[PDB]
Design brief:
Chains A, B: Belongs to the metallo-dependent hydrolases superfamily. Hydantoinase/dihydropyrimidinase family. The structure is a homotetramer. Chain A is an alpha/beta fold and 475 residues long. The first copy, chain A, has a single domain, classed as TIM Barrel (Alpha-Beta Barrel), CATH 3.20.20.140. The first copy, chain A, is built from 15 helices and 21 strands. Chain A has an 8-stranded parallel beta sheet with strand order 8-11-12-13-14-15-16-17. In chain A, strands 3-2-7-18-19-20-21 form a 7-stranded mixed beta sheet. In chain A, strand 12, helix 3 and strand 13 form a beta-alpha-beta unit. The first copy, chain A, is globular, with a radius of gyration of 21 Å. At the A-B interface, helix 8, helix 11, helix 14 and helix 15 of A face helix 8, helix 11, helix 14 and helix 15 of B. The structure holds zinc ion (8 copies). The site of one zinc ion has 3 residues of chain B, from loops. The site of one zinc ion (ZN) has 2 residues of chain C, from helix 4.
């Protein structure tokens, strides 16, 4: 199919310029001010609109069973929800249990996604335990399964948690094979203790998710894993950065030149922990994720500043909705509320509103934090995350003068609730092109299950490893 | 003239890729892996080399008379020195005296440069005093003389210094007309006192330049002007950032979201203040600039980290050589040693060595800090600072496997001394193309005086002002 | 010969708390011991279950001061009285001579207004509102001849009280040479001026403008600047009314670098938020208008208290300067004309005990530190004051760590329509206040003659600051 | 009845310096006054032009300790002797029981080795090198029955002394419940282990490897971690051998947040740089090998001293643990086998006076603070020790602030081939050292019987830490 996006302003992370885009066979063919095209192309009037690269969501949890609940959205509904939301790539999480096979898990997961995905996708494999079998499977996945990031956890003691001796080996292992070490940095011993301590104090509502794990526990673990990583020479990538404290640790480490990357979520960048104290339990429970939204009023504002600043590089949804019925399995015990929020569809709009409209960052940084930096790190740049010739035609015609008001009653993503209910948004995708096809236009979604493709991710992503390799010379 | 750069790796600030570049009529026509060209083009074998955008030097002082000495290099020798050094644009400084006309100064300066310049150029106008005539001339220069940055000074009391009441008005003035406020941030009252205090203590050698103005004076002024600027809503740009303290102030301000930009010099990023204590007075005096190179051993290393980090955005030469004979007018009084160092030719190589080879930043960040960010801020991006079609053909074929050892006895820039004497460098330009002509090849310079062009700079540079304007809505 | 015995108390000093009796005779503490063998005829005070602390010293009060076209409600009598009922036995006054006017003249007017009227011991700061070499001269006169060892400077109140950087440098140099303490109120005055007009021009005229016009970056800035100046001139610098997290960190940092910085906050800043400037009643919002303003950020008071406990901040004062709502109202249409002043001389000890000690931020011994001892050390009166030992002045309070009183305006003896602490449930109450070895407040009953109190000449070169500084610059 | 009068001195305590005489009888300070009316027969000490300071207390000594397969050169006699000649009148010993072994047994072995031999008063830390509920039990026994109120934990010495985070949490919880002080040596032990093997594998085997293997980020990390743990468990945490700028800032920050953190550095860390690990002679480089190592950055010592003056760091100790060059040499081919130990018990007071007081970083009163008073407060011995007042123990030193001695190994009485301070021109020298109201060192002549010194039971719940903590957690 031939597509021409006429009269737009192309926005990339470096600059915004008046140009048309001509797409043929899944690929951006031309980007120029006035394009001589053979006709019979679908023409899109993009006047007064921005032509941005399609969003990439570096943390989604479609079809994941976590904490005894299975995520409401499968790989179809999830990718669909993404595309309607202006996201044209999603990275999945694979969380194999302790003492189980990473490769087997990866394959189960590929089996669940390939037939069903609407947009391109890739996967993180979680390293939940450590033995010589695991190092082996890591190597296999990188060498020939198109995996270049692994997700580790410093909390979920006795479930996902890794000991410091293990992280050291795991990070060493990642660096050797050219992977990216994603770590979720909370101190798991103190999280375990603080949970029991809170239940024993008679604290059982959703607010306990906060009281049990105050930000010092994040700040601590974050600082620790950065040190480990810096010792092992492994690039470390921090997920779900939730707090001012943790954010500063990251800031500092970066200035010292430590190869630290970092990612927050939409909810963390925009919402406060006050919601855990809302009158309805259901409402409080809808916001339960980890690390939790922080009570301090200034935290969201600050995380957004850091995001604009590149202290935080990437914003993701961490999409993992559960129903209020599902959440309710912890109505009497907060520790049994499964950690998950709904966000895959809201990310682009919510971020545009609070980040761009709110004056914290320009439209170009918005591209940076929503697609470009992701693409660079995943090793897909500029094939994705940029509107230039040769690129994959993952393109969104973005309307900066829109009307939508977020409501759960109109969302196409899973969950009883939307964390952004009633939020007035001026960012809205009008058209979403994925693989050089229009999958969403006029508010109408149209796409076959399985149209999307797994995108093997190449090891040793240039944007992290090229300096590391050089710097290890001077040692 | 038609030029083809065959077999290079094109390096831009975002990525490095194997591509040819075809240039015709001063403009980059094509960038692609295998290019179908009509012959009779000059072919350049760029195999195994990097094809970078030509450097932009945001602070040069050609033909400037400062502190009773006139800079050794005129606009011809300076631009020549740049081009041999891999720099294809220079921004000049205009420092009109107190109670004198900015426009008149700007014209004298244009008169001195236009006939003589080898590469494209632009100018900063210095605002050394403040009255209603000055606001007027500022507006004139922005509106129709292609000026969009002004240089202010917080030191040089009774010469260039501006009072806080004046900075507030000047910054307000800049913001209204869409300019960039470059400030040289040292506390001028304390500098004055500390100079006299040091002379009175019998300290008269070059080391006095340090003892009289320790870094707390920079850190202070820097923090002050950022606050002023943030109050006036004016983007503030810090020049010659010399110190860890000052660097932290900047770091912090940035995280708070304050629209602060910043630039260091090559000497500050790579050399220590120890040189002021060298046995030869001449040698010590060659390094006398302000703010001075700092004694603390860790400062250069740290400024480089910040540079790689984007705490510091831009590296410049601040080229202003003087002869040892000229310097000597302060042999008995250090305060009368004119402030100036030689660097226009060394910048690219010295930075490549300490920054890239030294492992602090990749080749792509190197482009960022040496051309791209400059171009964005000057409002010339991607016309300059990037290798893409449409761009000005300011291109350098950079050799990353070179041999040169820096010596004064072979430099083409002014000065008895080179601050980097004996420094072994692996970065060297093989070819320098300016305005789609080859001006330096095989170690041979070839270019007519006046071939270069003043480049009117457009006000309201998108990279700073687009957020500012939006953010002022939420206020 | 008045004789007093304080039987069965726990003596609390800043170093430790121990069970001891105190015997006082002739204005002086005679004995401190567990069981005391004393000559009779003595007023016995049963201090069982109570703390016997040094009387409070309030390093910033503004009695009888005319400021911003209003005159402080409390004169020197009512003020000192208010202090004593509040557990404060010394107050340091502020003298603010206008620009181009004589410091000495001002100091004397002030002595004239206080000496006949004061109920407790007192001393004065003299404000250096301008600079010529005449001022240097008068500075020297006051130190050498008038018992002054601190001077108060301002970096804001442009065109009123403000000093330029060239002037501060000379002023601080001057202080260091005569052995004085440089108290600076650190806000950037140029940006304060601009931000005030910018806010009025934006149509912001209610009390909240006191905040919008001078956000904490302005304090942080000036604070950092005067510390640098001071460190260059080798002068000990003392920061007043520290109001913000930002400023507080600047101070923290400077201290760790070894810069001779001291610092003081107010009770209101240590305990209250700027949210009060947005209360519905204008009168209420206006009652809290001081500078630098209470900050909106919820965490600020908590943090300043932590710093206080930590010695980032050394001293807590009232900065007592009440005005009536009628008086405040002179800025009903323009917030810049609202006079800067809050009521606090009587609440300081109790409010601080509650939020600081009861609230778990600091122990009872640090509470003495920040309410009397450090003050005494810095004023060069230690251990003559700020400590319960033999030889000390009998400025002593029998403090009830238990009893709770609810603060109300309707029962206070200090001036002001309002109490910033209305309805605040406070632990901590003085039962007895002894000043100059006489009981001036007992059973909730005040009894004292005007003029009973005495100016206390303050000696230059206070050891606690100058001893290091002297060794420092003896050698580089 | 031994009687001593110290005539014509200036008594220096941590709060102030005043001209006073001291009269001692029966191990106790009887009177402190300007002119004293005393019964004769007394040994008179002419202390004119000298300071009469409390005797030093050294919170970290390792006499008779066998560590890393070497036994410390000084036994309890030579050690305490070395202390006294150095102006130190109390030492706190370290007891390091092996993993799975009894703390009480270890404590007793140690008491057995010290009681008959010690010249000055002493106490002990017990090291908690492992964790089961038996250990909790023994902890309780030692506090309740054996005069122990501090325990020493390690986050490094993996497989030797190291404790896991789950264990620290329980250990700290345990300490807080029995009212003890948790001393932690904070380096990340996993990264230390790895970095040591990584350095040996890189062919790095000289003393400099002690630095390369454990750069300061490892200290900063562990330090930050144990403070968090401690703050969660509500236990007061006390950091030992603080060696780095990074670590120091972590501590600074934590303190400002109000976290109940205390901290101690060593003399070597406060005054010397890691450049010594690169000296040509291996023996010399090896003499400085301790942990955490002296840091290469030139600014570190200067900064730690500033922090010490500032109370970011509270206490300075020797961490005395000499070994001979022959002994050190057991790691001539492998730096990881060089035993960690430096000589310092005798130099501490003089070296600190020189760099701290003479050098202008802190006054004479802070010098007492960091060398005796704070120690005494934390050990729960204040003002029985660490202060010259009546009732106090007569652990008193007549300190000569003037006299200069040049430090050499060839004249020291402490153990070790080497002095880290060789050739250092030091002001500051004790002329007379009185321990237990007896003169043990005068005229450069030591005179004292083995066993004259006494173990001093240390009471739990030291007020200076626990009084706030108790109020804190009584309320949230
Ligand atoms: Zn390996
Ligand atoms: Zn809610
Ligand atoms: Zn304007
Ligand atoms: Zn040199
Ligand atoms: Zn002088
Ligand atoms: Zn209110
Ligand atoms: Zn318990
Ligand atoms: Zn050495």
């Amino acid at each position: 199919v031939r597509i021409l996006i006429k009269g737009g302003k192309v926005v990339n992370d470096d600059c915004t310029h008046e140009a048309d885009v001509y797409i043929e066979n899944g690929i951006i063919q031309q980007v120029g001010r006035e394009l001589m095209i053979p006709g019979g192309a679908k023409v899109i009037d993009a006047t007064g609109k921005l032509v941005i690269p399609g969003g990439i969501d570096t943390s989604t949890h479609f079809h994941q069973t976590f904490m005894n609940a299975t995520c409401v959205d499968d790989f179809y509904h999830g990718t669909k929800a993404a595309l309607v939301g202006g996201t044209t790539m999603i990275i999945g999480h694979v969380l194999p249990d302790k003492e189980t096979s990473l490769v087997d898990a990866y394959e189960k997961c590929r089996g669940l996604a390939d037939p069903k995905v609407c947009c391109d996708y890739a996967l993180h494999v979680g390293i939940t335990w450590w033995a010589p079998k695991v190092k082996a499977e890591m190597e296999t996945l990188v060498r020939e399964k198109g995996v270049n990031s692994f997700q580790m956890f410093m909390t979920y003691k006795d479930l996902y948690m890794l000991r410091d001796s293990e992280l050291y080996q795991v990070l060493h292992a990642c660096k050797d094979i050219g992977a990216i070490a994603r770590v979720h940095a909370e101190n798991g011993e103190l999280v375990a203790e603080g949970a029991k301590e809170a239940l024993d104090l008679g604290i059982t509502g959703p607010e306990g998710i906060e009281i049990s794990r105050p930000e010092e526990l994040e700040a601590e673990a974050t600082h620790r894993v950065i040190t480990i990583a810096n010792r092992t020479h492994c690039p470390i990538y921090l997920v779900n950065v939730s707090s001012i404290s943790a954010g500063d640790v990251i800031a500092a480490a970066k200035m010292q030149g430590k190869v630290v990357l970092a990612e927050t979520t939409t909810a963390h960048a925009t919402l406060t922990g006050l919601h855990y104290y809302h009158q309805d339990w259901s409402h409080a429970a809808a916001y339960v994720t980890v690390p939790p939204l922080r009570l301090d009023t200034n935290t969201s504002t600050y995380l957004m500043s850091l995001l604009a600043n590149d202290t935080l590089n990437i914003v993701a949804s961490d999409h993992r909705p559960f129903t209020t019925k599902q959440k309710a399995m912890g109505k009497e015990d907060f520790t049994k509320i499964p950690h998950g929020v709904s966000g895959v569809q809201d990310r682009m709009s919510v971020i545009w509103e609070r980040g761009v409209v709110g004056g914290k960052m320009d439209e170009n940084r918005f591209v940076a934090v929503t697609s470009s930096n992701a693409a660079k790190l995943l090793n897909l740049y500029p094939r994705k995350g940029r509107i230039i010739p040769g690129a994959d035609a993952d393109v969104v015609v973005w309307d900066p003068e829109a009307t939508k008001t977020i409501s759960a009653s109109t969302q196409v993503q899973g969950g009883d609730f939307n964390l952004y209910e009633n939020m007035r948004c001026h960012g809205v995708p009008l058209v979403t092109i994925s693989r050089g096809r229009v999958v969403y236009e006029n508010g109408v979604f149209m796409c076959a299950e399985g149209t999307g493709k797994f995108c093997p991710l190449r090891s040793f992503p240039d944007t992290v490893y090229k300096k590391l390799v050089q710097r290890e010379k001077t040692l």
